[PDB]
Amino acid sequence: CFDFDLDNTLYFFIAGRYEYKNKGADMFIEALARLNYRLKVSGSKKTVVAFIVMPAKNNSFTVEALKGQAEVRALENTVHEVTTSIGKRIFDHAIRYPELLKSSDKVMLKRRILALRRPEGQLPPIVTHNMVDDANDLILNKIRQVQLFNSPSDRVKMIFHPEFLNANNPILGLDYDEFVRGCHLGVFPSYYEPWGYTPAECTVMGVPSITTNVSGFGSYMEDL
Amino acid sequence: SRDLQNHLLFETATEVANRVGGIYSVLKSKAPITVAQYKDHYHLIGPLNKATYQNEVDILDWKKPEAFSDEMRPVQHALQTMESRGVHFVYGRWLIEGAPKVILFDLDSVRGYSNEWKGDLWSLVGIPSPENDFETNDAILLGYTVAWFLGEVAHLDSQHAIVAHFHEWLAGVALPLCRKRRIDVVTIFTTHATLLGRYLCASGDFYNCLESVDVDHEAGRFGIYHRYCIERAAAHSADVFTTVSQITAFEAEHLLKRKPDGILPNGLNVIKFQLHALKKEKINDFVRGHFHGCFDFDLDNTLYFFIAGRYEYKNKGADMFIEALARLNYRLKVSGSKKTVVAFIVMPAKNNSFTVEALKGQAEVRALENTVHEVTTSIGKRIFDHAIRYPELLKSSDKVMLKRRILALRRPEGQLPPIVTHNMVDDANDLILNKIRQVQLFNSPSDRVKMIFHPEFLNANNPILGLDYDEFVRGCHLGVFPSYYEPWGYTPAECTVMGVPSITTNVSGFGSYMEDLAKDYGIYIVDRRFKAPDESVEQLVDYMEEFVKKTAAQAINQRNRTERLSDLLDWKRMGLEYVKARQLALRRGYPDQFRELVGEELNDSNMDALA
Amino acid sequence: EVTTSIGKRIFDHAIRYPELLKSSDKVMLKRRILALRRPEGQLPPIVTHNMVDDANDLILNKIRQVQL
Ligand SMILES: O=c1ccn([C@@H]2O[C@H](COP(=O)(O)OP(=O)(O)O)[C@@H](O)[C@H]2O)c(=O)[nH]1
Ligand SMILES: O=c1ccn([C@@H]2O[C@H](COP(=O)(O)OP(=O)(O)O)[C@@H](O)[C@H]2O)c(=O)[nH]1
Numbered sequence: 001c002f003d004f005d006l007d008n009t010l011y012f013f014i015a016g017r018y019e020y021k022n023k024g025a026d027m028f029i030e031a032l033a034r035l036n037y038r039l040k041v042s043g044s045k046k047t048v049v050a051f052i053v054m055p056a057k058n059n060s061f062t063v064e065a066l067k068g069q070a071e072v073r074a075l076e077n078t079v080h081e082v083t084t085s086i087g088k089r090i091f092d093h094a095i096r097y098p099e100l101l102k103s104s105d106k107v108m109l110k111r112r113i114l115a116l117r118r119p120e121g122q123l124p125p126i127v128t129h130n131m132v133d134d135a136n137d138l139i140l141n142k143i144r145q146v147q148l149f150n151s152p153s154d155r156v157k158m159i160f161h162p163e164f165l166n167a168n169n170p171i172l173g174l175d176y177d178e179f180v181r182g183c184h185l186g187v188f189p190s191y192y193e194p195w196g197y198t199p200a201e202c203t204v205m206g207v208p209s210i211t212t213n214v215s216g217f218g219s220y221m222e223d224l
Numbered sequence: 225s226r227d228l229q230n231h232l233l234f235e236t237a238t239e240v241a242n243r244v245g246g247i248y249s250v251l252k253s254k255a256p257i258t259v260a261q262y263k264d265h266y267h268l269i270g271p272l273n274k275a276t277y278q279n280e281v282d283i284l285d286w287k288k289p290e291a292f293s294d295e296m297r298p299v300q301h302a303l304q305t306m307e308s309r310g311v312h313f314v315y316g317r318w319l320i321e322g323a324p325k326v327i328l329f330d331l332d333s334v335r336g337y338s339n340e341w342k343g344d345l346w347s348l349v350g351i352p353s354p355e356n357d358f359e360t361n362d363a364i365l366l367g368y369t370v371a372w373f374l375g376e377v378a379h380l381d382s383q384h385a386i387v388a389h390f391h392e393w394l395a396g397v398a399l400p401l402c403r404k405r406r407i408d409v410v411t412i413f414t415t416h417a418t419l420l421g422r423y424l425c426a427s428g429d430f431y432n433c434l435e436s437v438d439v440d441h442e443a444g445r446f447g448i449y450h451r452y453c454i455e456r457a458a459a460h461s462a463d464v465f466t467t468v469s470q471i472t473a474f475e476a477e478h479l480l481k482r483k484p485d486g487i488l489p490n491g492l493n494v495i496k497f498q499l500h501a502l503k504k505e506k507i508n509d510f511v512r513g514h515f516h517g518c519f520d521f522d523l524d525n526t527l528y529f530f531i532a533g534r535y536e537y538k539n540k541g542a543d544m545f546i547e548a549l550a551r552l553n554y555r556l557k558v559s560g561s562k563k564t565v566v567a568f569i570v571m572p573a574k575n576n577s578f579t580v581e582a583l584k585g586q587a588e589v590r591a592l593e594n595t596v597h598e599v600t601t602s603i604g605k606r607i608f609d610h611a612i613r614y615p616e617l618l619k620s621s622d623k624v625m626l627k628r629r630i631l632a633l634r635r636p637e638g639q640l641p642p643i644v645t646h647n648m649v650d651d652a653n654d655l656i657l658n659k660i661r662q663v664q665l666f667n668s669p670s671d672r673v674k675m676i677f678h679p680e681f682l683n684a685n686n687p688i689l690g691l692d693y694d695e696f697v698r699g700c701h702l703g704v705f706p707s708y709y710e711p712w713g714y715t716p717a718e719c720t721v722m723g724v725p726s727i728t729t730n731v732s733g734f735g736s737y738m739e740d741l742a743k744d745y746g747i748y749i750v751d752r753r754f755k756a757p758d759e760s761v762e763q764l765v766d767y768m769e770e771f772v773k774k775t776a777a778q779a780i781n782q783r784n785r786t787e788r789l790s791d792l793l794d795w796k797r798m799g800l801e802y803v804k805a806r807q808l809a810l811r812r813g814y815p816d817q818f819r820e821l822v823g824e825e826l827n828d829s830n831m832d833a834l835a
Numbered sequence: 836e837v838t839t840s841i842g843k844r845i846f847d848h849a850i851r852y853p854e855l856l857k858s859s860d861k862v863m864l865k866r867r868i869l870a871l872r873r874p875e876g877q878l879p880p881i882v883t884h885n886m887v888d889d890a891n892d893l894i895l896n897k898i899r900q901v902q903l
Contacts, residue, residue, distance in 0.1 A: 060577035070683075103323065111319040114279045170685040512850060519850055592849060600842035607838065611868045617841075617855070630849040 001118065003152045009047035011183040015176070016198040018054040018162075020138040024189030024212065025052065029139070031189070032156050033146035039155040048156040051183075052139060053176070056162035059130035066170055071115045078112045124150040127160045128171055180205050190215045226385040226408075228810050228817055232299075232377075233258070233266045236370055236398065237391035238363075240270025241280040241318050241326055247391050247416060249714065253493045255322030257795040258802070264296060264325060265384070269373070270395070271366050272314055272328035281326060286315035298381030303327070305376050310334075311369060321493065327373075331365045341368045349400045349457050352450040359394065360450060367397025371407070374398070378408040385410070385814065387806050392416055393451065396458030403461040410813035412805055413462035414488055417472065417711040419448055419455050420479045425709040428538050431731055431753045435478045456480050464809040464831070469733025470740075472711045486805055486831035489737045490712050491798030494790055497721055500783075503691065503699030504528070510689045511566055513586035514642075514676070517635035520669045526564040527772060528700040532693070533715040535571045535679075537655040541706030541729065541752075542569065546656070548706070548764040549673050550663035555769055556672040563772055565673040568700075569656060570693070573679035576647035583687055588632045595629045641667040644677045645688055697722050701779075702771055706750060706764060707732045720747065723787035727767055730754075743767075746786025804831035837864060 014028045032050055039046070082105045089100060101109070126143055134140065139160055148158040165176040174182065186202040186209040195216035202209045211218040235258075239248040251268065258266055285291065292300040303315065312333035318326045341364055342353045353360055374388055386409040390396050393415070402411050420439065423446045424430055443452035459465050459480045466488045467473045473484040508523050531545050549567055556563070599622045606617060618626070643660055651657065656677055665675040682693040691699065703719040703726040712733035719726045725746035728735040731753050738747050748767045752760050774782070791797075808831045811818040819825050827833040837860045844855060856864070881898055889895065 104321065107319055107321065107323045110282060114319065117278060168687045592846065596842055596846040600838050600845065603841055604838035611864070614868050614871060626845070626849065630852050633852065
């Protein structure tokens with residue numbers, strides 16, 4: 001259910017130690033729910049996918065989330081195989097001078113497309129892991145309270161990844177520094193934060209960011 | 225009078241378009257070869273699985289006049305007729321290589337006739353049917369429907385002879401009906417195992433005293449009677465009765481009480497596989513991350529052994545494997561050997577992903593690799609820039625980060641490399657861990673065979689072991705599959721196709737089959753059927769030892785030899801056994817018409833007796 | 836080649852815990868450096884090609900006239 005234009009979507013992210021109130025996770029999730037409303041009303045063309053990278057007690061990846069990446073990768077391979085077959089066929093014809101997809105290829109293509117179908121009415125998850133307390137976790141419950149559930153109607157999508165980032169992840173193959181750079185806007189709505197290295201290192205890496213005036217780094221930044 | 229020459233093929237099994245068994249694999253990989261031969265005369269039939277069919281089946285409109293050649297009309301009208309009476313089904317292509325046409329009956333649209341049918345069955349074949357057994361309810365439903373559909377085809381089609389193949393007891397209720405109603409189709413029943421075989425071996429003796437067990441009583445003892453009756457009825461009603469393996473055929477003869485007319489060994493789509501150095505290196509990379517902080521052996525002088533597959537401790541022969549390795553340890557310490565064997569058990573178990581310990585391992589060893597690289601390329605630039613300008617290279621800076629990365633490898637005194645890569649959800653009761661404890665293979669440097677249990681299938685995206693299973697297999701030196709109950713054994717056979725030496729048994733179907741075609745070819749066969757439990761084990765250790773003491777050139781000899789065996793196992797050769805089977809079914813069905821087509825009268829007691 | 840040898844040597848030492856250039860390497864290094872020496876007082880050319888008219892070409896003759 002991939003219904004939006006990646007050439008027209010922005011990636012927002014909040015990250016760091018899991019302090020719900022103090023890092024300002026609450027405000028973040030809440031403000032996003034509101035940015036959803038405004039973008040449906042303003043009938044906007046764009047899409048915001050927003051990551052919460054904050055470590056929580058977990059049991060590694062959800063079977064759902066892993067199948068996701070797997071099938072989509074197998075699509076990539078099969079497409080590639082198929083295209084390079086077309087390549088050889090197209091070239092070999094030209095060099096000799098004086099439907100390019102055989103049945104064979106149509107089949108394994110059709111199969112890889114069918115594997116993407118997801119069980120009717122099942123939406124993209126809001127969490128990438130097996131949460132060890134799915135009922136009491138502050139972050140999930142707030143993103144439920146605001147009903148950001150990733151239905152196609154929703155213009156801001158919600159991804160909670162309760163685990164630091166490592167390039168070797170089945171799901172998201174980046175280190176944290178890699179990931180930060182690949183995003184569009186860091187958001188760190190902190191309430192108690194004597195300095196805040198997350199936003200400051202966000203800035204050093206050349207990414208736009210939102211902090212507060214109760215953040216140390218905010219405080220400092222304000223005077224420039 | 226019908227055309228034996230150009231005939232119709234309907235292969236029926238529970239698995240058609242849904243992985244539930246291993247038969248799925250058999251049929252899926254046999255499709256390409258049989259579609260090639262029979263084109264659109266060939267249909268697979270099975271129960272529709274409303275949960276998965278949409279991922280595996282190109283649904284087709286079977287009503288368009290275009291859907292069938294004119295000579296194939298009958299089948300269309302047959303379905304037409306079937307719809308009339310209110311039977312629902314999916315016509316479609318099964319999206320595999322081959323893309324064979326598939327008929328998937330909707331068992332719900334017929335679940336009404338259930339009581340009437342359970343009855344009719346009892347009073348034609350005396351097959352009991354408790355109502356709490358859903359598999360047999362479905363097996364009966366499927367049976368009556370398919371028999372029905374063949375009734376119709378045999379009725380409407382008058383040009384082609386009709387052969388109908390059924391795999392395993394669940395798809396086997398149709399068989400009695402066909403013989404009873406004297407429907408005009410010749411029938412083949414293949415069994416990929418027996419019911420009693422499985423149930424007897426599930427406790428821990430068989431191949432000896434199996435020729436002398438009271439079938440009717442043991443089937444009872446297990447609460448299996450009605451299932452057993454179907455499997456038996458299936459085997460006697462069929463015109464041709466077969467099994468996948470020589471070994472299973474002996475089991476079948478005494479347990480179902482009919483001698484198989486032939487064997488239908490499972491081949492593979494060999495092209496779908498076809499390096500070793502390239503992949504061995506990925507395994508080296510894992511072994512270094514794992515034994516970090518006490519890496520005391522020469523990788524240029526270590527061999528990788530592996531057992532893999534479904535987690536059946538007794539039947540896959542995990543026990544013998546671990547045990548025999550403990551013994552291969554002894555022998556290698558005494559014989560004071562220079563070499564090291566690291567042995568993987570890739571068998572899926574209940575787990576909580578990776579152990580912190582095991583993940584730190586790979587992480588720190590990777591950070592070493594980076595730092596070394598960064599450092600060396602710095603030396604590079606420095607060396608070059610000096611030369612190009614003409615007329616301790618490690619600065620302090622580099623020494624520091626080098627020293628730190630080396631220090632991170634130190635492991636807490638007396639802590640050994642783990643025997644398991646995952647968080648086991650039952651560390652105390654798991655059969656594999658407890659056996660590798662009982663034998664005290666704990667990976668101390670004294671130990672010459674190291675033990676790695678990886679309770680999880682292999683995927684290239686693993687933090688620990690960055691291979692797919694095919695990649696991993698190739699990177700190893702010897703597969704070891706000491707199986708005790710194993711009607712075929714795809715794990716060893718695909719091991720061989722990939723050009724890796726392997727050890728199987730003579731109670732393995734694949735073993736059984738392989739025996740008839742010695743060890744120089746990369747296939748060792750342990751005798752598990754005649755020698756006693758212990759001599760078996762010992763024979764195993766002798767085989768491993770011999771392998772360890774092979775020279776660099778002796779090993780490259782074997783490997784090159786097994787690699788040529790591969791083409792023997794493709795369907796292109798193994799498929800010919802199915803042709804023998806189908807044609808024996810015809811020769812038995814139309815003894816007269818067959819004589820005309822051949823020019824004489826050929827023997828009809830085996831499939832080998834025929835050709 | 837030489838550096839990646841150093842690489843392997845440095846790493847293998849560390850992984851096992853508990854002048855990196857052998858003679859072998861010094862030699863082929865020394866030889867490659869010596870091959871750069873150019874015949875005394877011979878300067879870097881002002882032209883990369885074999886000119887079919889080295890005497891009349893406008894471009895060469897101007898860059899001679901200015902003695903670059
Ligand atoms: O996936 C991640 C996310 C966090 N970080 C690091 O972990 C620290 C956690 O941020 P925290 O909020 O605790 O720092 P603060 O901003 O409060 O100083 C950051 O400095 C990041 O450099 C990381 O290494 N990987
Ligand atoms: O990590 C793994 C381990 C095994 N397999 C596959 O699983 C099968 C295991 O065979 P199984 O034991 O289930 O059946 P049998 O050995 O009796 O044929 C092999 O065919 C492999 O192709 C896999 O894909 N990934």
